[PDB]
């Protein structure tokens, strides 16, 4: 029962459920950032502060081309300038330094020991992160219009609403720290906004996960399954007809066809 929160220590996870990890626990000013599988190590633990810094091992997360190049790195707070260690977390997964307004934290490939980087903001599956000490993907059903669950169908190639079944493996999904909705049985398959369209809107279907901005999704307070960014579009059964068997990403009018529920 206090509303001010001064200091906090959590951990940061991302693409394919990998954690933001300071390289080899090394403490020196200028030590590298990597993705590493999650665990109980002090280098993976991150502490947020009221000033705006995020620290590990006594030193703040930093970004600057003039000093370290493209890379992201921990550095001592008192010696370094003021602007290269301010950070900001946004509701749809974007970690970014406000002082570098066009840019965003990124893992360029998904596989262990990747160096993290600041890249231009495209709101991509890679540029998306979940801040929070619970790093595991949130497994459950997705329920849409008329209490139909989203089903991974046709050998897991195409996705549409079908009528609920208890514990159907294909009807459950797994929402990952990166933004992606993965299939429960298979994790290499994932949800995607495909290039093939209907009535000048993109059809959503499953594909192999690459980490592109066709694949990053956010569950909004209004109950939409939506894309990140100022421009917004949401998941949508087309014209509320389950028979068509197609979900279209559309302008968010926010009617029942764009209402969804994570039934965990």
């Amino acid at each position: 029962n206090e509303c001010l929160v001064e200091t906090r220590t959590t951990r940061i996870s991302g693409r394919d459920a990998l954690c933001v990890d300071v390289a080899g626990a090394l403490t020196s000013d200028g030590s590298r950032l990597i993705l590493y599988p999650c665990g109980q190590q002090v280098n993976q633990k991150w502490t947020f502060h009221s000033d705006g810094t995020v620290r590990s091992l006594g030193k703040c997360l930093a970004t600057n081309n003039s000093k370290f190049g493209n890379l992201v790195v921990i550095y001592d707070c008192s010696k370094l300038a003021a602007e290269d260690i301010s950070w900001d977390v946004s509701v749809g997964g974007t970690i970014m330094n406000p002082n570098y307004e066009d840019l965003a934290l990124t893992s360029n490939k998904a596989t262990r020991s990747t160096n993290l980087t600041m890249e231009v903001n495209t709101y991509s599956a890679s540029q998306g992160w979940r801040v929070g000490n619970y790093v595991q993907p949130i497994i459950g059903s997705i329920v849409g219009l008329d209490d139909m669950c989203l089903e991974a169908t046709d050998g897991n190639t195409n996705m549409w609403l079908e009528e609920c079944v208890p514990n159907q493996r294909e009807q459950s999904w797994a929402l990952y720290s990166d933004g992606t909705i993965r299939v429960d049985d298979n994790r290499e398959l994932c949800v995607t906004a495909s290039s093939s369209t209907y009535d000048n809107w993109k059809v959503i279907t499953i594909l192999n996960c690459d980490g592109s901005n066709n694949q990053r999704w956010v569950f909004l307070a209004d109950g939409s399954i939506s894309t990140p960014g100022n421009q917004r579009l949401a998941m949508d059964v087309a014209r509320s007809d389950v028979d068509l068997k197609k979900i279209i990403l559309h302008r968010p009018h926010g009617d029942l066809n764009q209402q969804w529920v994570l039934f965990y």
Binding site: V91, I138, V143, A221, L262, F263, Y264
Partner: protein, 206 residues
């Protein structure tokens, strides 16, 4: 106006009107339709007695609108009482007839299926499934943890706005296979999708 009335009618067209304190999102009182009696929880706020159901004999019930008191008064836990279309129907009748031996349990059905359903989309959908599939459910830890944690969640949502969406304190919730999720930040669909209305704690901006 501090209170909000809504009407629940039964399978025999028996209507009650229930009164919600908008401030805390709890039921304070109700009146059966065409009845000179109205019934108030023991901890209902004074203003409620002075404003609601003035044209009636206002009776003070033998429990408060807290879960603990409704559970001790009904002799069971939320973990035991089944919810669904039919048990709701029955609860409405019981409140209409003012049956003292059922009341606390009749409230546990109504409150859960209307007020807790308004607070959380997970609970809303759990209840909608009873209507859809014609079959009832008695809540596990997953619904009980949300019910029990609503005020703390609300406080922690409001608190997070002073530190990048992180909570002041971990909030333990459970999934539908009774597994523990220690939530500690706004950045979970468990919170952000789920919570539909939040209890005021502090004056903060996003």
């Amino acid at each position: 106006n501090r209170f909000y009335l809504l009407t629940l009618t039964s399978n025999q067209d028996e209507s009650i009107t229930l009164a919600i304190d908008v401030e805390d999102m709890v039921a304070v009182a109700y009146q059966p339709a065409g009845s000179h009696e109205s019934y108030f929880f023991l901890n209902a706020p004074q203003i409620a007695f002075h404003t609601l159901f003035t044209d009636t004999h206002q009776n003070v019930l033998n429990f408060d609108n807290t879960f603990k008191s409704l559970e001790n008064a009904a002799g069971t836990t939320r973990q035991t009482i089944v919810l669904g279309v039919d048990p709701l129907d029955f609860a409405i009748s019981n409140l209409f007839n003012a049956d003292p031996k059922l009341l606390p349990l009749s409230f546990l059905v109504i409150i859960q299926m209307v007020l807790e359903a308004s607070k959380f989309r997970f609970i809303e959908q759990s209840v909608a499934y009873s209507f859809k599939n014609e079959k009832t459910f008695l809540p596990d830890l997953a619904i009980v943890s949300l019910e029990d944690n609503w005020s703390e969640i609300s406080l922690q949502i409001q608190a997070s706005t002073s530190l990048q969406g992180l909570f002041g304190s971990v909030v333990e919730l459970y999934n539908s296979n009774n597994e523990l999720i220690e939530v500690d930040s706004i950045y979970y669909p468990i919170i952000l999708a789920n919570v539909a209305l939040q209890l005021y704690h502090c004056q903060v901006s996003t």
